[PDB]
């Protein structure tokens, strides 16, 4: 689970100012609901958080109841712990457990929680700059890593978007946490639509290039259930991926080979 950088034939290197972080960082004008309304699950054990009995999957619609499984990951095939196909194709938020439930580390519904489990290697492609590829196979439904950075608000973003988009570098690195909008519305408480920006701090996924026939997709992973306006951004493999293939994903869902190329990005 080490990050390695490789650049064949270019004189470029990572900006000494860029910094790698393990968890996202909230800016100061953003929301943190009281520890007074936090709820995890009492489940005992371990757990048995894979069945509807667990309060973590309430919003998750269905000798006487059933008493069937429902947690959005597979429980026992060679695909155990891989995103259910029902969730891949259907793109419904992933309701995961957290530090508020009577369940531990392996709780089957805490995949994104555990973080990345596959080693990644940033390598220098030739046209699109830096890109990412994995030194080991990744079956479809697999969790690669999540998109991090510094969480901010629509106004302060508007601030950077133009301050930047106008006089200098275009390289956009702002991801919008809008799965819910838107629703519631108103206022409540106180206060009566805030975003994540990782230009100067982030994870490997900060370097994945856009494609129009991606081999990866992003899903929202929710926890506390109050902490959902600032939901995690999970990058899941939507199809099996050989080693050495450059991870990709549609920035909304261009130099991409993709015959289906939507013209440009964003």
């Amino acid at each position: 689970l080490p990050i390695s950088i490789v650049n064949r034939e270019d004189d470029a290197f990572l900006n000494p100012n860029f910094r790698f972080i393990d968890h996202s960082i909230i800016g100061k004008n953003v929301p943190v609901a009281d520890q007074s309304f936090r709820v995890g699950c009492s489940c005992a054990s371990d757990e048995e958080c894979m069945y509807s009995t667990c309060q973590c999957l309430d919003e998750m619609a269905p000798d006487p109841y059933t008493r069937k499984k429902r947690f959005a990951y597979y429980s026992q095939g060679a695909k155990k712990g891989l995103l259910r196909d029902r969730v891949l194709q259907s793109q419904e938020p992933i309701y995961e457990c957290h530090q508020g439930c009577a369940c531990s580390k392996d709780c089957p519904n805490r995949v994104v929680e555990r973080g990345r489990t596959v080693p990644l290697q940033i390598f220098r492609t030739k046209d699109r700059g830096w890109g990412v590829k994995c030194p080991v196979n990744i079956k479809r439904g697999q969790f690669v890593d999540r998109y991090l950075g510094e969480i901010i608000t629509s106004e302060e973003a508007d601030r950077r978007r133009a301050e930047s988009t106008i006089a200098r570098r275009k390289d956009v690195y702002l991801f919008a946490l809008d799965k819910f909008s838107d629703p519631d519305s108103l206022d409540p408480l106180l206060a009566g639509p805030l975003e994540v920006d990782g230009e100067y701090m982030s994870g490997p996924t900060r370097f994945i290039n856009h494609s129009c026939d991606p081999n990866m997709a992003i899903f929202a992973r929710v926890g506390d259930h109050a902490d959902k306006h600032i939901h995690d951004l999970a990058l899941f493999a939507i199809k099996d991926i050989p080693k050495g293939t450059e991870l990709t994903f549609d920035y909304v869902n261009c130099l991409c080979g993709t015959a289906k190329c939507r013209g440009y990005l964003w």
């Binding site: 998109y147 956009v172 702002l174 991801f175 809008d178 929202a220 869902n253 990005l265």
Partner: peptide, 7 residues
């Protein structure tokens, strides 16, 4: 621009 998630 910015990265998003809608439908």
């Amino acid at each position: 621009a910015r990265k998003s998630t809608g439908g």
